[PDB]
Every structure is written in structure tokens, then in C-alpha cells.
Amino acid sequence: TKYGENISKHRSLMSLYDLHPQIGYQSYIAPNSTVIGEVTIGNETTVWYNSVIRGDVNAVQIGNNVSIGENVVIHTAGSLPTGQPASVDIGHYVIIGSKSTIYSCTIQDEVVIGQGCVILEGARIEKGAMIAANSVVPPGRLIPAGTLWAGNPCTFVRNLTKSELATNIDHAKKQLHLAQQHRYEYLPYNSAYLQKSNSEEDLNPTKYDDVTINYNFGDEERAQENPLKY
């Protein structure tokens, strides 16, 4: 009854009455991925398949040319004990491994998060730091810039060299062409609607609304930069 239907009612982008997500140019959000709430995505940012990003409880900021990964859940907290803003902030060239969970945190530029990491609320990862795949950053913990940490709880290993930082930046830049290759496979016009069957509601609306404005106003002049656009 409530949940009985054959066609899924899932949308990648959603808002809660005031919280419209914003996505930059050349940014690919996978159809499986869900991005709901006050979420801002920068330019060339790629969110892979089956990743959830909820900015409903608080704002979420995502930098430019970052990779989020697969099966990654990013969400905010109501507040922090220190009184700091609880919004999620991620810098540029940040790579987040798959299976990872991000709480209200502050990730700076060129940070690399391994696969399956768990960063808890209040964590502050500085520029260039790296995290082992199966490590946990406890709440309110500061990871210094250009340092390597591993384990659960995370513990220091050694400092990172300019070569390692350059390699991380290069990988972040390299993800972009794969994202574009995935993007090119979708046409700007969705053809799924052509596969449905007319229903009574479709053929005769129950109630009518007053024509105010079409959301696709001027789309005959707008460029189809992102094929996955409503």
C-alpha cells in the first residue's frame, strides 16, 4: 500500500523546503548517489555510485576537483561541544575512499581519506594529511598537515614528503577524466518517461494549478552542460 509500486521514486537531488543543493560545472553525481539538503558541490567534483550526502541537519561544503568515492556517507551533526559550526567542510583536491563515513568535520585541501575510514564529529584534518583505510579519527581530534595516521584510534606514523603530496594531487586531478568518460554516456534528455504506461491520474488530473512559471524557462538557450539535469 504505502510502499507498493513497481517503479522507484528515488531522485539524486532533493531539498527540504529551503535547502536546494548546488553543483558546479563538470561535476558528476551518480544516479545511484543521493545528495539531499543544504549541500554545495564545487567544480569538477565527482560523486560515485551509491554515495549519500545529507546536509539536512546542517550545511555541507564540498571543494573543487574532489572525489567522494563509492558507498560513502557524508552527514552533519546538530552541534559541536566546542561551539564551532557543525557543517561539513571539505577542501579542494580531497579524495575520500569508498565505504567511509564523514561526520561534521573540517577537511582541508589535498587531504586523502582511505577506504572505510570513520571521521567523527569535530575532527579537523589539515592540508595534505593522509589516513589509513580502516582507521577512525575520534571526535574533536586535530590531524596536522602533511602527516600520516593509521589505526583505530588513529596514531601517527611519519611525515609526508612533497613527492607524496604531488602524487595525491595528481590522482585527484586524474579522477576528472574518468568522471567525464562516465558523464558522456548520458544524453541531455531522459528517455525513461517514454517507457511508462498512461494512468488515470496522468490522463485526467484530480486538481489543477495556476500557471506561474516553468522551471525550464529559457532552457532553449541554456546549455546542456550536465546531462543529468532535470
Partner 1 sequence: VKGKGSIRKGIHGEGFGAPSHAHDALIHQIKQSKDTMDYQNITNEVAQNFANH
Partner 2 sequence: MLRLRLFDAYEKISMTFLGPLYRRIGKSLAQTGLNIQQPYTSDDRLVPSLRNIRVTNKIPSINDSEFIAPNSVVIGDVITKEGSSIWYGATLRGELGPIEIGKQTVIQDLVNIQSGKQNQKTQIGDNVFIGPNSYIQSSKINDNSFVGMGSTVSTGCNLASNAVVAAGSVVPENTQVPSNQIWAGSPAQYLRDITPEERQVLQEHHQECVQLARIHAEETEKSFREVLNDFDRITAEAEYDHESLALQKMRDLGFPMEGEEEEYIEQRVFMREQLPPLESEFWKKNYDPYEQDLFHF
Partner 3 sequence: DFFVDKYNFSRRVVDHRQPYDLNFSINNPVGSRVWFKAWKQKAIGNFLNLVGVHYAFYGAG
Ligand X SMILES: CCCCCCCCCCCCCCCCCC(=O)OC[C@H](COP(=O)([O-])OCC(O)COP(=O)([O-])OC[C@@H](COC(=O)CCCCCCCCCCCCCCCCC)OC(=O)CCCCCCCCCCCCCCCCC)OC(=O)CCCCCCCCCCCCCCCCC
Contact residues: ligand X, CB under 6 A: 220-221
Residue 38's binding partner among partner 2, partner 1, ligand X, none (Cβ under 5 to 8 angstroms by kind) is: partner 1
Contact yes or no for 125/111 (Cβ under 8 A): yes
Binding mask 35-74 for partner 2 (x = CB under 8 A): -x-------------x-x-x-xx-------------x-x-
CA distance 122 to 48: 25
Of 29, 33, 34, 38, the one binding partner 1 by CB under 8 A? 38
Q: Which is nearer to partner 3, 209 or 220 (CB)?
A: 209
Which residue, among 49, 150, 164, has the nearest Cα to 110 in the 3D structure? 164
Residue 90's binding partner among partner 2, partner 1, ligand X, none (Cβ under 5 to 8 angstroms by kind) is: none
Asked if 212 is part of the footprint of partner 3 (rule: CB under 8 A), the reply reads yes
Contact yes or no for 66/88 (Cβ under 8 A): no
Which residue, among 51, 151, 135, 141, has the nearest Cα to 104 in the 3D structure? 141
Asked if 198 is part of the footprint of partner 3 (rule: CB under 8 A), the reply reads yes
- Phi, psi (rounded to 5 degrees) for 61: -115, 125
CA distance 123 to 143: 8
Name the site residues for partner 1 (rule: CB under 8 A).
17-19, 38, 57-59, 78, 85-87
